Design a protein around this ligand. Structure first.
Ligand SMILES: [Zn+2]
Ligand SMILES: [Zn+2]
Lengths: 100, 285, 285, 100
């Protein structure tokens, strides 16, 4: 499955000033069943990262800070970290801003 | 209460009086309007500037911080008279806390949030919700900014039975992250970002008043072309290595009140008496 | 030329000095920078305010109009010192014309357009093109506004052989419509619209200077992630009967120099000597 | 062909404060060959209009003022008023703003 992944809200700083990310995924996960978004978090944080982990994912889960959107749709109703990724989906990782 | 327009006022407002939606009728809305801004630095200034200019009846401001001796509230108000002498500016020359925040809001028709501290940001929504007031919240750090219009129109606490505007908790459920928090003092700020966001904040507030969007609807549902009950969270990223990009303004439509929200949802253990006492202690850090 | 930073300056700019892209290195760019604003009312004010604040070296302003006795140039400059004492503000206390416009631009590094008259808007691009200067143009009437970044980096007149930034004529080819023209005096203006647009204009100008985007590229082509040669035309519509809508900010990518453009294209009959004489008489009305 | 049509830049004022417009078209024009965008101008101005003609189209052609975009793409390279409309195309009519 080839998808486009985006960052914003002072997150992309982690990924070397890059917001737009296109990488094709394996259709099947490690245990042979279809890619979930538990996968994308693991793949991204381990390989796509360009910085020290604390700021994106901690204790085997995303930091409460960030929101995830699938085709600009709430991640929680559509699968909530166990979502069979689609062949051209868009996933957005935005760190909620609490300064002003 | 004022029913008529001064030659003084008619002269000042004529430039925006002759626009679709903003008659002698639409302008008087703003003149009798009472808006409050929580936070005087950064987003406060431009927000306040464009309310003042618009001739918002009364404009409140809340900041105990001084300039970089002289409180920033006072500095700013002094500024605003120059823009528009006619409005009544009301300085809360201290910092908001649970003990008072209840007191500081009950008067005002529309609440703007520029507070810059996560704990405070949650506090306001809670109160705003309970007291039954619409919040235009907005945030800015470093190269990025974002804005949203919550609890408009203001739907009573726990009324999940009707399509109902989301609270700040409903949105941004439990985070703030404890060690992922950067401040405007900590991480800096480009000017045009906080500027865009403030000006827009005023924008949303003015809209709410002029078109009367804080007014509950007729058993009829609320039009979704207002984007009130399902409101966009506009995210502005400022890239100083690029021109205006298609992905400069991204508009993330948001969900109506989360039926299970701690605060505005069904079976909330949140009371105005509570926050006063230190009840949901804002130790989430 | 200035190589070092005053404790005075270091104190004022520290808030935006500590942001990615904006070091002692990035800040000095702005301090040696020379920006010009054509038009002092409406878009002028906020544009100028956020350049001033940013500490743009020299800030020019051009408007022969008075307030509603005292020229609006003077009024505004008086305002700006309050925001930032350190910049050199330079008032052209008259109105721009073909006879002078050549003279009024040749000094300045970046040109902002806030002129509010269609004839003038075309004139500037022509000159800006010929003299070889980048234009951040912006417009606002009533409930709607829009912005674009032309001729950045500035590609010489007629050089169609290379991927090259579009002029105002290249974009907006022959229109202005004669009887479809509304002015800001004619049709009014909501505050947050002109505010958003001005603040953004400053935004684009600052970017150009800080990241050095007016600098021609290395036989190498220009990165398209700058959105300079193929620049977005951001359109802001302000609906005062709705909240921020997904279709609030729409971003229309635009074409590089039209090879057949009257002015910046191949076989242009446009000369700096020409405009002076009244050559392309701005009778398009 | 069902398409969505939009207005902006102080044009929609003509169409009663409405920007978004969805109406399905006949696939074939009056003379039986496929719908062009010469058609949409004629259909819109005659039926969809809510105001007096001078401001949108004059002398059997759009006012020089306005730009037309097809899927946010310049109209001029893609057909320029003689464009076979597609089954889900987006056409945008924005009056160029010359005030400030
Ligand atoms: Zn809630
Ligand atoms: Zn050209």
């Amino acid at each position: 499955i080839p998808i486009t992944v985006d960052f914003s809200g002072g997150l992309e700083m982690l990924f070397d000033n890059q917001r737009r990310h296109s990488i094709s995924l394996p259709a099947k996960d490690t245990e042979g069943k279809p890619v979930t978004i538990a996968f994308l978090i693991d793949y991204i944080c381990k390989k796509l990262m360009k910085d020290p982990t604390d700021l994106f994912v901690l204790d085997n889960h995303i930091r409460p800070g960030i929101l995830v959107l699938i085709n600009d749709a709430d991640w929680e109703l559509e699968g909530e970290e166990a979502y069979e990724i689609q062949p051209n989906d868009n996933i957005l990782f935005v760190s909620t801003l609490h300064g002003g | 209460t004022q029913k008529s327009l001064s030659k003084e006022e008619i002269e000042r407002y004529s430039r925006q009086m002759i626009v679709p939606g903003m008659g002698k009728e639409g302008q008087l809305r703003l003149m009798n309007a009472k808006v409050l801004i929580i936070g005087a630095g950064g987003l406060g200034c431009p927000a306040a500037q464009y309310l003042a200019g618009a001739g918002v009846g009364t404009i409140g401001i809340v900041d105990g911080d001084s300039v970089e001796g002289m409180l920033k509230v006072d500095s700013l108000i002094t500024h605003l008279i120059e823009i528009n002498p006619l409005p009544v500016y009301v300085p809360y020359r201290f910092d908001l806390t649970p003990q008072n925040a209840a007191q500081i809001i009950k008067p005002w028709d529309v609440i703007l949030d520029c507070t810059d501290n996560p704990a405070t940001r949650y506090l306001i929504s809670d109160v705003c919700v309970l007291l039954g007031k619409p919040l235009v919240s907005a945030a800015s750090v470093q190269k990025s900014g974002q804005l949203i219009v919550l609890n408009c129109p203001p739907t009573p606490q726990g009324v999940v039975n009707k399509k109902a505007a989301p609270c700040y908790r409903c949105c941004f459920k439990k985070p703030p992250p404890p060690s992922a928090q950067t401040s405007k003092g900590e991480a800096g700020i480009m000017g045009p970002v906080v500027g865009m966001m403030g000006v827009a904040q005023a924008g949303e507030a003015i809209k709410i008043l002029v078109s009367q969007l804080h007014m509950p609807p007729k058993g009829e549902e609320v039009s979704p072309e207002k984007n009130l009950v399902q409101p966009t969270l506009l995210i502005y990223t400022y890239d100083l290595n690029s021109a205006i990009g298609p992905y400069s303004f991204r508009a993330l439509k948001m969900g109506g009140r989360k039926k299970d929200c701690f605060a505005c949802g069904e079976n909330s253990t949140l009371t105005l008496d509570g926050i006063k006492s230190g009840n949901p202690n804002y130790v989430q850090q």
